[PDB]
């Protein structure tokens, strides 16, 4: 439990810190893939297994790949150079971040929950009947969202 958990969560927070800190877009995104890897790990540890594998495959594997293709196809890490810094903002961003952290910590305190569910390792064998079942409307709506999304994205480029 705590043995691995400490290392895992520390690595999580560290990874996030990097992805918001690094000044190299490639390096940043990369750190975010590290994040997603560790995250899929944690999902596995949290009895959400299929979700974890989708986390590697879709999020780490595919999405941040699109991000990388894009920052590479324009320019990455050399975009931030400009020096219109607003460094009076950095401690304000840091402070506001600490505030948005503190409020959530507060809301999460005093929560006594039974994290004991039989959620049989997030396998798609148990996930399926819900998805094409009680979730089928939301599923289909999501599908439509994907269609509209691709039509948008294509029409959002479309040279000529």
């Amino acid at each position: 439990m705590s043995l691995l958990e400490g290392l895992a969560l520390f690595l999580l927070l560290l990874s996030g810190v990097l992805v918001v800190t690094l000044r190299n877009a490639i390096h940043a995104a990369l750190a975010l893939i590290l994040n997603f890897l560790v995250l899929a790990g944690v999902y596995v540890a949290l009895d959400a297994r299929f979700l974890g594998f989708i986390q590697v495959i879709v999020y780490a594997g595919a999405i941040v790949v699109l991000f990388l293709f894009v920052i590479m196809l324009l320019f990455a890490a050399q975009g931030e150079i400009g020096f219109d810094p607003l460094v009076r903002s950095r401690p304000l961003a840091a402070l506001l971040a600490l505030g948005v952290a503190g409020i959530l910590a507060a809301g999460l305190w005093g929560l006594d929950l039974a994290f004991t569910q039989d959620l049989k390792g997030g396998l798609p064998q148990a996930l399926g009947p819900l998805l094409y079942g009680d979730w089928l409307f939301v599923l289909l709506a999501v599908g439509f969202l994907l269609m509209a999304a691709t039509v948008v994205a294509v029409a959002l480029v479309e040279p000529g």
Binding site: L13, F67, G79, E80, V100
Partner: peptide, 22 residues
């Protein structure tokens, strides 16, 4: 709690990041 901390970290990202993609 790590989730909340991460969300906060992302907020810091948005507020800090100079370029659109980031």
């Amino acid at each position: 709690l790590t989730s909340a901390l991460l969300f906060a970290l992302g907020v810091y990202g948005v507020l800090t990041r100079r370029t659109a993609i980031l």
